[PDB]
């Protein structure tokens, strides 16, 4: 699905060593710009072992 593609692309992104050295807020804005919902972003951060609350992600994006 296009959803799973979005989340998979986010995971690959978040795993990058440079990206790991980038702040969460930056990453979150970036992912929204690529069309991901807050929920999809939250999924991705948990999948990579850097879990964030949906609440924190929505706050970044608010
Ligand atoms: C917000 O921080 C960044 C954004 C983009 C970049 C540039 N790329 C970083 C590595 C990268 C990117 C992308 C990427 O833009 N993929 C497209 C995509 C599509 C939908 C959701 C997420 C990513 N994927 N990867 C991993 C495999 O190359 C984008 C950054 C690079 C270093 C540090 C921070 C970056």
From TrEMBL:
Record function comment: Component of the PEX13-PEX14 docking complex, a translocon channel that specifically mediates the import of peroxisomal cargo proteins bound to PEX5 receptor. The PEX13-PEX14 docking complex forms a large import pore which can be opened to a diameter of about 9 nm. Mechanistically, PEX5 receptor along with cargo proteins associates with the PEX14 subunit of the PEX13-PEX14 docking complex in the cytosol, leading to the insertion of the receptor into the organelle membrane with the concomitant translocation of the cargo into the peroxisome matrix.
Family note: Belongs to the peroxin-14 family.
Coiled-coil annotated spans: none
Peroxisome membrane anchor protein Pex14p N-terminal domain sequence ranges: 2-46
Protein name: Peroxisomal membrane protein PEX14
Parent-record interval covered: 23 to 84 of 366
Native species: Trypanosoma brucei brucei
The gene coding this protein: PEX14
Cellular localization per UniProt: Peroxisome membrane
């Amino acid at each position: 699905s296009e959803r799973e593609k979005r989340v998979s692309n986010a995971v690959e992104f978040l795993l990058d060593s440079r990206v790991r050295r980038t702040p969460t807020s930056s990453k979150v804005h970036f992912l929204k710009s690529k069309g991901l919902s807050a929920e999809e972003i939250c999924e991705a951060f948990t999948k990579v072992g850097q879990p964030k609350t949906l609440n924190e992600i929505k706050r970044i994006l608010s």
